[PDB]
Design a protein around this motif. Sequence first.
Motif, PDB file in Angstrom:
ATOM      1  N   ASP A 257      71.685  -0.293  14.940  1.00  0.00           N
ATOM      2  CA  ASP A 257      72.557   0.673  14.286  1.00  0.00           C
ATOM      3  C   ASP A 257      72.879   0.308  12.842  1.00  0.00           C
ATOM      4  OD1 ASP A 257      73.932  -1.510  15.497  1.00  0.00           O
ATOM      5  OD2 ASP A 257      75.841  -0.481  15.152  1.00  0.00           O
ATOM      6  N   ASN A 258      72.176  -0.662  12.263  1.00  0.00           N
ATOM      7  CA  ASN A 258      72.395  -1.070  10.882  1.00  0.00           C
ATOM      8  C   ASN A 258      71.049  -1.180  10.182  1.00  0.00           C
ATOM      9  OD1 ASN A 258      73.093  -2.456   8.413  1.00  0.00           O
ATOM     10  ND2 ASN A 258      74.989  -3.123   9.412  1.00  0.00           N
ATOM     11  N   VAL A 259      70.911  -0.486   9.050  1.00  0.00           N
ATOM     12  CA  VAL A 259      69.639  -0.481   8.334  1.00  0.00           C
ATOM     13  C   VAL A 259      69.327  -1.857   7.759  1.00  0.00           C
ATOM     14  CG1 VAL A 259      69.738   1.984   7.859  1.00  0.00           C
ATOM     15  CG2 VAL A 259      70.792   0.369   6.267  1.00  0.00           C
ATOM     16  N   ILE A 260      70.355  -2.653   7.459  1.00  0.00           N
ATOM     17  CA  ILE A 260      70.120  -4.005   6.965  1.00  0.00           C
ATOM     18  C   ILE A 260      69.507  -4.870   8.058  1.00  0.00           C
ATOM     19  CG2 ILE A 260      71.208  -6.047   5.973  1.00  0.00           C
ATOM     20  CD1 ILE A 260      73.256  -4.280   4.691  1.00  0.00           C
ATOM     21  N   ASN A 261      69.995  -4.731   9.293  1.00  0.00           N
ATOM     22  CA  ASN A 261      69.381  -5.435  10.412  1.00  0.00           C
ATOM     23  C   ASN A 261      67.967  -4.935  10.679  1.00  0.00           C
ATOM     24  OD1 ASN A 261      72.538  -5.644  11.082  1.00  0.00           O
ATOM     25  ND2 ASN A 261      71.467  -7.323  12.120  1.00  0.00           N
TER      26      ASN A 261
ATOM     27  N   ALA B  25      65.872  -3.876   8.363  1.00  0.00           N
ATOM     28  CA  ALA B  25      65.002  -4.394   7.313  1.00  0.00           C
ATOM     29  C   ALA B  25      64.653  -5.858   7.538  1.00  0.00           C
ATOM     30  CB  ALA B  25      65.661  -4.209   5.946  1.00  0.00           C
ATOM     31  N   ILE B  26      65.552  -6.623   8.160  1.00  0.00           N
ATOM     32  CA  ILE B  26      65.272  -8.031   8.424  1.00  0.00           C
ATOM     33  C   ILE B  26      64.173  -8.167   9.469  1.00  0.00           C
ATOM     34  CG2 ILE B  26      66.240 -10.196   9.257  1.00  0.00           C
ATOM     35  CD1 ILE B  26      68.907  -9.385   8.104  1.00  0.00           C
TER      36      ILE B  26
ATOM     37  N   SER C 216      60.842  -6.807   8.216  1.00  0.00           N
ATOM     38  CA  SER C 216      60.152  -7.674   7.268  1.00  0.00           C
ATOM     39  C   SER C 216      59.285  -8.698   7.986  1.00  0.00           C
ATOM     40  CB  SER C 216      61.164  -8.375   6.365  1.00  0.00           C
ATOM     41  OG  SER C 216      60.519  -9.270   5.475  1.00  0.00           O
ATOM     42  N   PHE C 217      59.740  -9.183   9.142  1.00  0.00           N
ATOM     43  CA  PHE C 217      58.938 -10.133   9.903  1.00  0.00           C
ATOM     44  C   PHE C 217      57.696  -9.465  10.478  1.00  0.00           C
ATOM     45  CE2 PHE C 217      57.697 -12.324  13.756  1.00  0.00           C
ATOM     46  CZ  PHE C 217      57.630 -13.634  13.334  1.00  0.00           C
TER      47      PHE C 217
ATOM     48  N   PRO D 249      73.391 -12.758  16.007  1.00  0.00           N
ATOM     49  CA  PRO D 249      72.312 -12.238  15.156  1.00  0.00           C
ATOM     50  C   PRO D 249      70.929 -12.732  15.570  1.00  0.00           C
ATOM     51  CG  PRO D 249      73.487 -13.982  14.028  1.00  0.00           C
ATOM     52  CD  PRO D 249      74.274 -13.677  15.268  1.00  0.00           C
ATOM     53  N   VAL D 250      69.942 -11.835  15.516  1.00  0.00           N
ATOM     54  CA  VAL D 250      68.615 -12.154  16.026  1.00  0.00           C
ATOM     55  C   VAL D 250      68.019 -13.302  15.229  1.00  0.00           C
ATOM     56  CG1 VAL D 250      66.304 -11.260  16.429  1.00  0.00           C
ATOM     57  CG2 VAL D 250      68.291  -9.825  16.877  1.00  0.00           C
ATOM     58  N   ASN D 251      67.542 -14.318  15.940  1.00  0.00           N
ATOM     59  CA  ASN D 251      66.891 -15.467  15.325  1.00  0.00           C
ATOM     60  C   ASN D 251      65.420 -15.131  15.106  1.00  0.00           C
ATOM     61  OD1 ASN D 251      65.456 -18.391  15.631  1.00  0.00           O
ATOM     62  ND2 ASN D 251      67.526 -18.605  14.791  1.00  0.00           N
ATOM     63  N   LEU D 252      64.970 -15.215  13.850  1.00  0.00           N
ATOM     64  CA  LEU D 252      63.597 -14.837  13.531  1.00  0.00           C
ATOM     65  C   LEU D 252      62.586 -15.744  14.220  1.00  0.00           C
ATOM     66  CD1 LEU D 252      63.745 -13.819   9.758  1.00  0.00           C
ATOM     67  CD2 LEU D 252      63.762 -12.379  11.804  1.00  0.00           C
ATOM     68  N   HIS D 253      62.917 -17.024  14.398  1.00  0.00           N
ATOM     69  CA  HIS D 253      62.037 -17.900  15.164  1.00  0.00           C
ATOM     70  C   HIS D 253      62.012 -17.497  16.633  1.00  0.00           C
ATOM     71  CE1 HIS D 253      59.918 -21.700  16.073  1.00  0.00           C
ATOM     72  NE2 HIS D 253      60.639 -21.681  17.180  1.00  0.00           N
TER      73      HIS D 253
ATOM     74  N   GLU E 136      65.490 -18.508   6.627  1.00  0.00           N
ATOM     75  CA  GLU E 136      64.349 -17.837   7.238  1.00  0.00           C
ATOM     76  C   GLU E 136      64.191 -16.410   6.732  1.00  0.00           C
ATOM     77  OE1 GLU E 136      64.869 -17.823  11.445  1.00  0.00           O
ATOM     78  OE2 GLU E 136      66.751 -16.693  11.401  1.00  0.00           O
TER      79      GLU E 136
ATOM     80  N   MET F 150      60.719 -15.216   3.633  1.00  0.00           N
ATOM     81  CA  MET F 150      59.883 -14.030   3.532  1.00  0.00           C
ATOM     82  C   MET F 150      59.841 -13.461   2.118  1.00  0.00           C
ATOM     83  SD  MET F 150      60.787 -12.087   7.119  1.00  0.00           S
ATOM     84  CE  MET F 150      62.487 -11.844   6.612  1.00  0.00           C
TER      85      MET F 150
ATOM     86  N   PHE G 147      62.889 -10.024  -2.122  1.00  0.00           N
ATOM     87  CA  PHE G 147      63.246  -9.225  -0.955  1.00  0.00           C
ATOM     88  C   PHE G 147      64.638  -9.581  -0.452  1.00  0.00           C
ATOM     89  CE2 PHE G 147      63.555  -9.328   3.694  1.00  0.00           C
ATOM     90  CZ  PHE G 147      63.550  -7.974   3.960  1.00  0.00           C
TER      91      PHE G 147
ATOM     92  N   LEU H 217      68.272  -7.360  -0.070  1.00  0.00           N
ATOM     93  CA  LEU H 217      69.168  -7.236   1.075  1.00  0.00           C
ATOM     94  C   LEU H 217      70.604  -7.571   0.692  1.00  0.00           C
ATOM     95  CD1 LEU H 217      67.094  -8.756   4.032  1.00  0.00           C
ATOM     96  CD2 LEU H 217      67.527  -6.348   3.516  1.00  0.00           C
TER      97      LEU H 217
ATOM     98  N   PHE I 186      80.320  -2.668  12.652  1.00  0.00           N
ATOM     99  CA  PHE I 186      79.179  -2.310  11.817  1.00  0.00           C
ATOM    100  C   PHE I 186      78.900  -3.385  10.774  1.00  0.00           C
ATOM    101  CE2 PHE I 186      77.519  -0.194   7.978  1.00  0.00           C
ATOM    102  CZ  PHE I 186      76.320   0.272   8.479  1.00  0.00           C
TER     103      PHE I 186
END
Lengths: 145, 152
Positions: A13-17, A19-20, A23-24, A119-123, B14, B18, B25, B29, B63
């Motif tokens: 529900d967040n465009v910033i989340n 984009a993260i 990006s991966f 928050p989602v861990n990219l690893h 991390e 990127m 980038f 953000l 949010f």
Amino acid sequence: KVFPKINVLIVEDNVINQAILGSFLRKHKISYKLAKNGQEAVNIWKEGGLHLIFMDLQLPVLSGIEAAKQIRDFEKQNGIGSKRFSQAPVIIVALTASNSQMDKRKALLSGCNDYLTKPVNLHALSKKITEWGCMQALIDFDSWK
Amino acid sequence: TIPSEIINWTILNEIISMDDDDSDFSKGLIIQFIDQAQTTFAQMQRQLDGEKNLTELDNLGHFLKGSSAALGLQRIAWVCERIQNLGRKMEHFFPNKTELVNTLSDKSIINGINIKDENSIYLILIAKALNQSRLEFKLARIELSKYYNTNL
């Protein structure tokens, strides 16, 4: 490392989340779509082609819990779970709030295959894509090994 | 308890990892978050001085928490969770500024000035926490400005 050629859907529900996580997937050449809420995720899933869905449990219009149950119910009606190739059920990884067992069971009882805490861990996001995606791209690939 | 550091570099590095292919980038953000935090703060302020809906303040805090936490901005996400529980009647106290700025590991940061009904008590705590969010938001902009070597 080598990533499987699968189609992914990330629902937040967040465009910033968005984009993260996007990006991966873009960095590793993974095709993906974006969804704003749960109702969009169900509609996008109806378009077919999805393999792996990273969906947040709490969503504005339709919660990720009800969206996951709505996807699992639609899969059973269409016989998902040679005359026609067996279409495998879509993998749904829930995005939970904490690492408590209650947050885990709520995702498992709703039809989700796995879970990731926010928050989602990219690893950790990477490991979920290889653990579930490579089992859908390769035969007898044991991710539990 | 509120985290001691403003930036959780373990989460943010991390994301900066990127920036090799997509140049600047992560800076995009941050700029996108500053616009989101200013808009979210204005929507919170619009409800405190206007129509009061604690469910919306619950959702506004949720949010901004999801974005600030994903960018490693711990203290902003922590106060957003406080506003989140204050709107849900789950918490009944929000500490003062002098108590929260004493939790910083590096104490050289704060060298500047900080600017009836059944819901009246919680709205004051939300109005007090929204102002604390403004300080944590300014401290994060100063910390991220030094890293990126750009003004915000």
